Design an enzyme around this catalytic site. Sequence first.
Site, PDB file in Angstrom:
ATOM      1  N   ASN A 214     -14.276  -4.788  -9.014  1.00 17.45           N
ATOM      2  CA  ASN A 214     -12.220  -4.890  -9.251  1.00 17.45           C
ATOM      3  C   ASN A 214     -11.864  -6.086  -8.717  1.00 17.45           C
ATOM      4  O   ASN A 214     -11.284  -6.635 -10.056  1.00 17.45           O
ATOM      5  CB  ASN A 214     -11.656  -3.839  -8.464  1.00 17.45           C
ATOM      6  CG  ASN A 214     -10.561  -4.002  -7.546  1.00 17.45           C
ATOM      7  OD1 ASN A 214     -10.022  -4.673  -8.225  1.00 17.45           O
ATOM      8  ND2 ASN A 214      -9.587  -2.462  -7.372  1.00 17.45           N
TER       9      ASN A 214
ATOM     10  N   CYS B   1       2.427  -1.721  -9.745  1.00 17.64           N
ATOM     11  CA  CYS B   1       2.730  -1.051 -10.821  1.00 17.64           C
ATOM     12  C   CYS B   1       1.846   0.250 -10.793  1.00 17.64           C
ATOM     13  O   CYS B   1       0.033   0.412 -10.177  1.00 17.64           O
ATOM     14  CB  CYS B   1       2.079  -1.791 -12.095  1.00 17.64           C
ATOM     15  SG  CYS B   1       1.628  -0.536 -13.606  1.00 17.64           S
TER      16      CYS B   1
ATOM     17  N   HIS C  91      -6.309  -2.996 -10.812  1.00 19.25           N
ATOM     18  CA  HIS C  91      -5.288  -3.109 -11.862  1.00 19.25           C
ATOM     19  C   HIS C  91      -5.293  -3.635 -12.772  1.00 19.25           C
ATOM     20  O   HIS C  91      -5.903  -4.792 -12.669  1.00 19.25           O
ATOM     21  CB  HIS C  91      -3.637  -3.939 -11.297  1.00 19.25           C
ATOM     22  CG  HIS C  91      -3.120  -2.877  -9.703  1.00 19.25           C
ATOM     23  ND1 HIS C  91      -3.514  -2.053  -8.993  1.00 19.25           N
ATOM     24  CD2 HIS C  91      -2.351  -2.165  -9.564  1.00 19.25           C
ATOM     25  CE1 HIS C  91      -2.977  -1.274  -8.247  1.00 19.25           C
ATOM     26  NE2 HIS C  91      -1.984  -1.526  -8.812  1.00 19.25           N
TER      27      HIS C  91
ATOM     28  N   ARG D 273       0.829  -1.361  -0.083  1.00 21.89           N
ATOM     29  CA  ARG D 273      -0.125  -0.404   0.020  1.00 21.89           C
ATOM     30  C   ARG D 273       0.629   1.276   0.200  1.00 21.89           C
ATOM     31  O   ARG D 273       1.964   1.010   0.603  1.00 21.89           O
ATOM     32  CB  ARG D 273      -0.890  -0.099   1.015  1.00 21.89           C
ATOM     33  CG  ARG D 273      -1.898  -0.896   1.502  1.00 21.89           C
ATOM     34  CD  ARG D 273      -3.245  -1.517   0.402  1.00 21.89           C
ATOM     35  NE  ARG D 273      -3.321  -0.016  -0.137  1.00 21.89           N
ATOM     36  CZ  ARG D 273      -4.212   0.137  -1.686  1.00 21.89           C
ATOM     37  NH1 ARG D 273      -3.674  -0.360  -2.460  1.00 21.89           N
ATOM     38  NH2 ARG D 273      -4.359   1.304  -1.912  1.00 21.89           N
TER      39      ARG D 273
HETATM   40 ZN   LIG Z   1       1.057  -2.849 -14.742  1.00 24.36          ZN
END
Ligand SMILES: [Zn+2]
Lengths: 162, 162
Positions: free
Chosen positions: A118, A104, A97, A60
């Site tokens: 999600n 990332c 993501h 985090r």
């Molecule tokens: Zn990525």
Amino acid sequence: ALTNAQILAVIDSWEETVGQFPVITHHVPLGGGLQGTLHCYEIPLAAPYGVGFAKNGPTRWQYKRTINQVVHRWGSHTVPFLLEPDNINGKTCTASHLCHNTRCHNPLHLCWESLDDNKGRNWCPGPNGGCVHAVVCLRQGPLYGPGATVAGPQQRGSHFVV
Amino acid sequence: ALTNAQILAVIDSWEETVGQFPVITHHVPLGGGLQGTLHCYEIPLAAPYGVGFAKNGPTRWQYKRTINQVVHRWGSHTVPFLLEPDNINGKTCTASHLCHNTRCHNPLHLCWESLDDNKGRNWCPGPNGGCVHAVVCLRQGPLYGPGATVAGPQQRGSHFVV
DNA sequence: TTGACTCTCTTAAGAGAGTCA
DNA sequence: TTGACTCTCTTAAGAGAGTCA
Ligand SMILES: [Zn+2]
Ligand SMILES: [Zn+2]
Ligand SMILES: [Zn+2]
Ligand SMILES: [Zn+2]
């Protein structure tokens, strides 16, 4: 920030800093037996992470900027969506993501949706395997597959019926 | 309890009383635009629930049995699989409701698998929509769909690529 | 104003055990 | 013995906020 123009400036400085994060090339399944390539801009494993970045948990991070003497803090992946609604259908919007790589911060790899939407992408077949998500998936989903069930539906007697 | 014969006896008495829970017919999406019919043996909403059953949470219950003067207790949906391994590849095995009906205790609607395999069924297309789970889904999955993404992947400048 | 740590909380799919009668 | 309540914990997807120099 407070004005839309000030939030834009915060987003710009965030993109500028993340843009310099090591860019890693990953080969991923897209579904349908096809393979693709994804380029992730990954935050370092340890300090320093980048101007404005600090780790608040194992995976985090938070981004912080001081505008006019007052400190502002946002979750690491939420910055690109600072100018969009923060809830939908009564549900809080979260940074999802598309690449499934927590470190990332490439904004071309994130979308803003509910936690349920999600999480579900973890099991999607992929953009080439039947994905039906309106904001299409970039890759399969690490958890998609036959699964590894230990025991299936079963009964010892005959008290039940499907 | 401890022995195999004592465990079977627990599964047998469990099935017997659950086999007496009110049976509710549920018509569900199967995927591929088809509809099916499931028969759930649902635990009552309030006490009494049944011999050996007690509610420990809004949608959690425990099954209790006094074997050798010593009381044993299990999660109400776990009893059917007391003889199976309690973990797979290091992951705790979980009672997965194929019918996505928490109050249902019909063993023919339950499977034993990791929490990840468990959750993923919420987004499965279904037995008639492309489900690839080794232990096949009984229905589509409440969360399957396009989703409601508020914002997709975007960037303001030109520092990123997919 | 900043960096590098600290802390607890949210969601839903699931769990464990204790207090009384 | 059996019933009916009470409490907190687990796991991954994801969060907000405090301390200190
Ligand atoms: Zn990525
Ligand atoms: Zn998808
Ligand atoms: Zn059922
Ligand atoms: Zn399935």
